[PDB]
């Protein structure tokens, strides 16, 4: 069975952990330890194909060492995720993207932009600019929210789709 | 000012002295110098390289590649090593 | 400690890597300890908008052979300060190789190392054949030339 | 615009440059200074074509694209009466060795 190794990146407090758990344990987690980084495996079906997802939920302080570089280098696809309530996350998306391109040694790395917390009424960045930036990157944008869980599976499965397109 | 460069097969190549001075070994041999180990098809390439070097040294824009045919590669290499250029 | 190192400036600088060479260009960034770090390659004739930081040291080589290349008619490249948000341009070009080095390049592309010494040339050229371009050796040379 | 040429006669080859605007007569003067023959006793050729010492080099077909330093375009030279344009050829490289 074909495996897909997914890596979720973003600033601390964007919702990476809660979103990741929402993909697997099917429950929104209101508060998760900011320091806990772990991987999770889940057997799923995408377009009929029985895929195995391996999701690394990144967390912790910056580490631009050889070891962290190689750890992230094993990622086949990346979820650059931001929160619509935090401007800094949408600004940081670019830095995370450049780091991915460095460790993957390519300008074309499978990834999907995510606008999380689409249940919060406050909007610092609307759904419109994110699609513009993704267009500048050449990736899809999904406005999923882990709290309401709308579009989370769409995001992960779209990353698997982008990976499949890159492998073909 | 010009210098004559005679090849092993008797070909006379007249180049500007400033350009032939690119070769350290030629600059050491100093207005007519004979080479008994370098054929005409090699000395012609060496002279072309002299003009190429003088034209593009300290140029501000892009530089074209110096073309070297595989069949001449070895002989040109030996000539370059001996001429110190 | 090494003289040829990048500065931990943490100030963004947008740079344009322009490959105006026939070769496949490997960008090499000198980290804060001076060690060369290869970056993604540029196909010939390609321009790419990269993001670096002020005071960072860059050099450019042939991706396949590590042959030396020039950037803005010099060996090393350091981004300046971006005036009004415009990008700095890094023009990567060929240098005027010595005829000996150019011939050594082409012979290296034809013969395999296993057969290098089976060529009817002076023995002095055999070691020169196996002495492939080295980023570290050029860094040593450049450092002493600054001194 | 500079054009880089090797003007040849018999076993002699003169490497020099000129302007694309430079006329055939000025090049004949250049060869007078080197081979000691005035633009009277000499006739320049592009391929088998005789060049009229009044037209510019670029007007004869000598462009920067076709007359580079690393690949100069050839201009034949012939000297009572003139001689048949004779350019003795260069040597030939050997058969390419097995290892290449
Ligand atoms: N309203 C809302 N809150 C969210 C959403 N996703 C995450 N959060 C909250 O944001 C906080 C930080 O998210 P967290 O999972 O710890 O992200 P991480 O630490 O970067 O991996 C958590 O307490 C979540 O309750 C969402 O879609 N909507
Ligand atoms: Mg976390």
Author numbering:
A (entry chain D): 1 to 168
B (entry chain B): 17 to 46, 58 to 112
C (entry chain C): 60 to 206
D (entry chain A): 1 to 79, 83 to 103
Text of the article:
Kirsten rat sarcoma viral oncogene homologue (KRAS), a key component of the pathway, is the most commonly mutated oncogene and is a key driver of tumor growth in several human cancers. Proteolysis targeting chimeras (PROTACs) are heterobifunctional modalities, which recruit an E3 ligase to a protein of interest, resulting in subsequent ubiquitination and degradation of the target protein via the ubiquitin-proteasome system. Here, we address this gap through the development of heterobifunctional VHL-based PROTACs capable of engaging and degrading KRAS­(on), thus addressing a wider range of KRAS mutations.
Leveraging established cocrystallization protocols, , we crystallized ternary complexes of VCB-PROTAC-KRAS with KRASG12V-GDP and KRASG12R-GCP as representations of KRAS­(off) and -(on). Analysis of the ternary complex structures of 1 and 3 with both KRASG12R(GCP) and KRASG12V(GDP) showed that the same relative orientation as previously solved cocrystal structures was adopted, regardless of the mutation or nucleotide. The main observed difference was the loss of interaction between 3 and Tyr112 of VHL, relative to that of PROTAC 1. However, there were no significant differences observed at the KRAS–VHL binding interface to explain the observed difference in the ternary kinetic stability between the two compounds. As expected, differences in the Switch II loop are observed between the G12V­(GDP) and G12R­(GCP) variants for each compound.
